[PDB]
Design a protein around this ligand. Sequence first.
Ligand SMILES: Cc1cn([C@H]2C[C@H](OP(=O)(O)O)[C@@H](COP(=O)(O)O)O2)c(=O)[nH]c1=O
Ligand SMILES: [Ca+2]
Length: 129
Amino acid sequence: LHKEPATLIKAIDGDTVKLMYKGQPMTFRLLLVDTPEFNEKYGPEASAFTKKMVENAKKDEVEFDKGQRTDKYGRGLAYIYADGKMVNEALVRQGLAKVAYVYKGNNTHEQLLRKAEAQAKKEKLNIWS
Ligand SMILES: Cc1cn([C@H]2C[C@H](OP(=O)(O)O)[C@@H](COP(=O)(O)O)O2)c(=O)[nH]c1=O
Ligand SMILES: [Ca+2]
């Protein structure tokens, strides 16, 4: 896989963010994770965590997997990096997202994320508390 440039347009919630990619606005849905909705427990904390990462970064990047690049709603499907740190993994490691929506052929980072989740669960963080 490879990282590509993007710029933040606006944070939306824990697992969606609006970026400019190849000069066009797009909503991205983060691969392999599920944050709580804003109205649910940990939802506001997941939104705030993603927003801080993507806003404070000097450089945001998108990395598509090998399969589908957009979902049925027209959202981009990608791993998002903020100054080289993967948002998807960081949410899981903090217990602010579960590993979820693991479809075959866009699952390159599945085991990296499952290791983060085991660590968050052992530490009883957030969703796992
Ligand atoms: C993360 C991801 C979600 N989706 C779809 C499945 C779910 O469909 P349904 O809307 O029918 O439930 C929805 C979950 O997104 P949200 O968690 O953003 O609601 O997005 C994919 O198709 N591919 C993906 O990789
Ligand atoms: Ca969600």
